Design a protein around this nucleic acid. Structure first.
Ligand SMILES: Nc1ncnc2c1ncn2[C@@H]1C[C@H](O)[C@@H](COP(=O)(O)OP(=O)(O)[C@H](F)P(=O)(O)O)O1
Ligand SMILES: [Cl-]
Ligand SMILES: [Cl-]
Ligand SMILES: [Cl-]
Ligand SMILES: [Mg+2]
Ligand code: NA
Ligand code: NA
Ligand code: NA
Length: 326
DNA sequence: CCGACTGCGCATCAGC
DNA sequence: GCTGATGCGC
DNA sequence: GTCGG
């Protein structure tokens, strides 16, 4: 892709600031720059050219200037050789280890993959399962495997109740030829903004998926969000599929369109769209879009009958899921 | 210059 | 137990 | 780190 060198660098800078510096605005700034440059349809040739895009200011401009001259960036290379930074960054790759636990583990001298296995008694549950499948969760999921995962989920969801609708979101819905995990939006018509006419609604689905041995592990669960692990079944003599992260969100059925807009993303598109919502004086979440009053108070939920209606309110031309991969 | 930066579910911890 | 703040991940 | 007012 066209500016891979530059965006890779900004992403490594973003990760450093989040994981090591715990500077979450620099992280979000670097990611925004990495995003707007990733879609810029020319091969960048100077820092000043890039400064024209919003989100690239002066600091990033000079870094682009150095990178284009030398092919590298001294800030990054010094960071790659600071053993502490290098080790915090690595620990945050285990699901459930963020910048704080990663640094906490440094101070105790727990630093390699082996150190983690040696010390499983120091991990909470999520961190334990993340260590268990560390290598699997690094692998991406070919869309062909996603189609099989979708057929299992949707067919097993129907066998619990045929009134459930389950929609696969994430990069899958955006047309990606591969995905990092599997995001499932769930609706059932006895769970609306007005009433929870049935308990266990998400449990029943998770239970069925464990009974057929599709869902293999649980990172976290509550009445509307499930995050865990699943595995496709394999054939005789055939190697096993990698284990895969799976998330299931139960959203009130009358709030489907805000939920599917949320869960389709991308995360940076969502962040860009909600930012623009605020410029137009609205606030969007995964349930509602509401006006902000003269006092900044969120008002009452506007009516939404399509994904497009949400775009209409904030005066954006509608964007198809495939064009939301920011 | 400088306030503001998207929004939220679940796990965990502190303090009561 | 609850509440509110924080970590973490989406 | 960036930027709109
Ligand atoms: N910080 C955030 N703010 C707002 N929305 C956010 C968000 N983080 C994740 N979301 C998202 C949108 C995403 O598509 C959806 C699922 O989030 P996810 O982490 O699975 O990202 P995807 O978009 O599916 C990736 F492309 P991949 O899974 O293929 O690697 O919820
Ligand atoms: Cl910051
Ligand atoms: Cl809706
Ligand atoms: Cl709401
Ligand atoms: Mg995903
Ligand atoms: Na700019
Ligand atoms: Na992690
Ligand atoms: Na996910």
């Amino acid at each position: 892709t066209l500016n891979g060198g530059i965006t890779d660098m900004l992403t490594e800078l973003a990760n450093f600031e989040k994981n090591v510096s715990q500077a979450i605005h620099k992280y979000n700034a670097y990611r925004k720059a990495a995003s707007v440059i990733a879609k810029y349809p020319h091969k960048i040739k100077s820092g000043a050219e890039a400064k024209k895009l919003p989100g690239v200011g002066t600091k990033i401009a000079e870094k682009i200037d150095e990178f284009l001259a030398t092919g590298k960036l001294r800030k990054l290379e010094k960071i790659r050789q600071d053993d502490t930074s290098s080790s915090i960054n690595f620990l945050t790759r285990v699901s459930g280890i963020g910048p704080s636990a990663a640094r906490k583990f440094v101070d105790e001298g727990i630093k390699t993959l082996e150190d983690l296995r040696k010390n499983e008694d120091k991990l909470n549950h999520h961190q334990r399962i993340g260590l268990k499948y560390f290598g699997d969760f690094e692998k991406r999921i070919p869309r062909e495997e996603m189609l099989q995962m979708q057929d299992i989920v949707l067919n097993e969801v129907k066998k619990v109740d045929s009134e459930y609708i389950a929609t696969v979101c994430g990069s899958f819905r955006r047309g990606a030829e591969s995905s990092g995990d599997m995001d499932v939006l769930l609706t059932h018509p006895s769970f609306t903004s007005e009433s929870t006419k049935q308990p266990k609604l998400l449990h029943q689905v998770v239970e069925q998926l464990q009974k057929v041995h599709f869902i293999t592990d649980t990172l976290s669960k509550g009445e509307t969000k499930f995050m865990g692990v699943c595995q496709l079944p394999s054939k005789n003599d055939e190697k096993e599929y990698p284990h895969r992260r799976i998330d299931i969100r139960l959203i009130p059925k009358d709030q489907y369109y805000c939920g599917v807009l949320y869960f389709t993303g991308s995360d940076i598109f969502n962040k860009n769209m909600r930012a623009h919502a605020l410029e137009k004086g609205f606030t969007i979440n995964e349930y509602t879009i509401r006006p902000l009053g003269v006092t900044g108070v969120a008002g009452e939920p506007l009516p939404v009958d399509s994904e497009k209606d949400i775009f209409d309110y904030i005066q954006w031309k509608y964007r198809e899921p495939k064009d939301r991969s920011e």
